[PDB]
Amino acid sequence: KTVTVRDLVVGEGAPKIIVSLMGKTITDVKSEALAYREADFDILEWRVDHFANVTTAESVLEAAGAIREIITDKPLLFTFRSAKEGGEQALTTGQYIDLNRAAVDSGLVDMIDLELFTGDDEVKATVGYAHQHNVAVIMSNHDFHKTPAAEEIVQRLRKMQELGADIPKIAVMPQTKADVLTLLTATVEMQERYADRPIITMSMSKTGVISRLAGEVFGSAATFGAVKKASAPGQISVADLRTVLTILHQA
Amino acid sequence: MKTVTVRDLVVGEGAPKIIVSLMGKTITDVKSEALAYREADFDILEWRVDHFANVTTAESVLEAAGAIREIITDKPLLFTFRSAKEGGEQALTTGQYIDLNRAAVDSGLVDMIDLELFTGDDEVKATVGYAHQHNVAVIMSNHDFHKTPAAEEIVQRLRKMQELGADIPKIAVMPQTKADVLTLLTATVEMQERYADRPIITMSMSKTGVISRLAGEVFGSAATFGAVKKASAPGQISVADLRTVLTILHQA
CB atoms under 10 Å from CB of B210, counted, come to 24
How many angstroms separate the CA atoms of B203 and B209, rounded? 7
CA-based nearest distance B217→chain A, Å: 10
How many angstroms separate the CA atoms of B245 and B234, rounded? 18
Distances in Å between the alpha carbon of B31 and those of B8, B23, B52, B93? 24, 10, 12, 27
Query: A134 in the Ramachandran plot: left (φ > 0), alpha (ψ -120 to 50) or beta?
Result: left
Please identify which of the residues A74, A142, A177, A229 carries the catalytic annotation. A142
Nearest to A219 by CA among A250, A194, A247: A194
A214: nearest CA partner in chain B: B211
Query: A13 in the Ramachandran plot: left (φ > 0), alpha (ψ -120 to 50) or beta?
Result: left
CB B134 within 8 A of CB B164: no
CB A203 within 8 A of CB B185: no
How many angstroms separate the CA atoms of B48 and B89, rounded? 9
Catalytic residue flag (residue A229): no
Nearest to B47 by CA among B32, B28, B68: B68
How many angstroms separate the CA atoms of A122 and A243, rounded? 40
CB A123 within 8 A of CB A166: no
* Residue A251 DSSP one-character state: -
How many angstroms separate the CA atoms of A202 and A184, rounded? 8
Helix axes A238-250, B239-250, angle to 10 degrees: 140
Nearest to B172 by CA among B199, B140, B204, B213: B204
CA-based nearest distance B174→chain A, Å: 15
Query: B121 in the Ramachandran plot: left (φ > 0), alpha (ψ -120 to 50) or beta?
Result: alpha
Query: A66 in the Ramachandran plot: left (φ > 0), alpha (ψ -120 to 50) or beta?
Result: alpha
∠ Cα B27 B32 B36 (to 5°): 145
> N- to C-terminal Cα distance for chain B?
24
Catalytic residue flag (residue B143): yes
How many angstroms separate the CA atoms of A31 and B229, rounded? 45
Give the H/E segment covering residue A151: helix A150-162
Over its C-alpha atoms, chain A yields an Rg (Å, rounded) of 17
Burial level of A249, CB count in 10 A (0-12/13-18/19+)? Answer: exposed
CA-CA-CA-CA dihedral for B127, B128, B131, B135, to nearest 10: -170
Which of A203, A213, A249 is the best mutation test for B, with the most CBs of B within 10 A? A213
User: How many Cα atoms sit within 13 Å of A79 on the Cβ side?
Assistant: 29
Burial level of B73, CB count in 10 A (0-12/13-18/19+)? Answer: exposed
Considering only CB atoms, which chain B residues are within 8 Å of A184? 182
How many angstroms separate the CA atoms of B57 and B47, rounded? 17
DSSP per position, A81-96: -BGGGT-SB---HHHH
Considering only CB atoms, which chain B residues are within 8 Å of A240? 248
* Residue A228 DSSP one-character state: S
CB atoms under 10 Å from CB of A157, counted, come to 27
How many angstroms separate the CA atoms of A99 and A93, rounded? 10
Distances in Å between the alpha carbon of A21 and those of A7, A84, A213, B50, B248? 21, 20, 21, 55, 23
How many angstroms separate the CA atoms of A133 and A144, rounded? 32
CB neighbours of B132 closer than 8 A, spacing ≥ 6? B138, B165
CA-based nearest distance A92→chain B, Å: 36
∠ Cα B127 B133 B138 (to 5°): 50
CB A226 within 8 A of CB A19: yes
CB atoms under 10 Å from CB of B8, counted, come to 8
**Letter string b/e over residues A127-154, b meaning 16 or more CB atoms within 10 A of that residue's CB:** bebbeeeebbbbbbbbbeeebbebeebb
* Residue A2 DSSP one-character state: -
Q: Is B89 annotated as a binding residue?
A: no
Q: Collapsing DSSP states into helix, strand and coil, what is residue A105?
A: helix
Q: What are phi and psi of A207, to 5 degrees?
A: -60, -40
Nearest to B160 by CA among B124, B203, B117, B197: B117
Burial level of A244, CB count in 10 A (0-12/13-18/19+)? Answer: buried
Nearest to A182 by CA among A214, A146, A233: A146
How many angstroms separate the CA atoms of B68 and B77, rounded? 9
DSSP per position, A164-184: T-SEEEEEE--SSHHHHHHHH
How many angstroms separate the CA atoms of A72 and B249, rounded? 33
CB B101 within 8 A of CB B127: yes
Using CB atoms, which residue from A218, A219, A236 is nearest to B252?
A: A236
CB atoms under 10 Å from CB of B156, counted, come to 15
Distances in Å between the alpha carbon of A54 and those of A61, A90, A98, A114, B201? 10, 10, 11, 16, 51
DSSP per position, chain B: ---EEETTEEETSSSPEEEEEE--SSHHHHHHHHHHHTTS--SEEEEEGGGSTTTT-HHHHHHHHHHHHHH--SS-EEEE--BGGGT-SB---HHHHHHHHHHHHHHT--SEEEEEGGG-HHHHHHHHHHHHHTT-EEEEEEEESS----HHHHHHHHHHHHHTT-SEEEEEE--SSHHHHHHHHHHHHHIIIII-SS-BEEEE-TGGGTHHHH-HHHHTB-EEE-BSSS-SSTT--BHHHHHHHHHHHHT-
B192: nearest CA partner in chain A: A177
Nearest to B92 by CA among B101, A95, B105: B101
CA B186 to chain CA centroid, nearest Å: 20
Q: Is A68 annotated as a binding residue?
A: no
* Residue A191 DSSP one-character state: I
Mode of pairing for the β-strands spanning B9-11 and B17-22: unpaired
How many angstroms separate the CA atoms of B46 and B49, rounded? 9
Q: What are phi and psi of A168, to 5 degrees?
A: -65, 145
Distances in Å between the alpha carbon of B245 and those of A245, B21, B180, B238? 10, 19, 22, 11
CA-based nearest distance A205→chain B, Å: 9
* Residue A249 DSSP one-character state: H
Please identify which of the residues A145, A169, A177, A229 carries the catalytic annotation. A169
Q: Is A69 annotated as a binding residue?
A: no
How many angstroms separate the CA atoms of B87 and B145, rounded? 7
Mode of pairing for the β-strands spanning B168-173 and B137-144: parallel
SS (H, E, C) A26-83: HHHHHHHHHHHCCCCCCEEEEEHHHCCCCCCHHHHHHHHHHHHHHCCCCCEEEECCEH
CB A139 within 8 A of CB A165: yes
How many angstroms separate the CA atoms of B203 and B205, rounded? 6
Going along chain A from its start, the domains and CATH numbers come out as: 1-251 (3.20.20.70)
How many angstroms separate the CA atoms of B66 and A73, rounded? 60
The residue count of chain B comes to 252
Considering only CB atoms, which chain B residues are within 8 Å of A232? none
Q: Is A197 annotated as a binding residue?
A: no
Residues in chain B that come right before a backbone break, where C and next N are over 2.5 Å apart? none
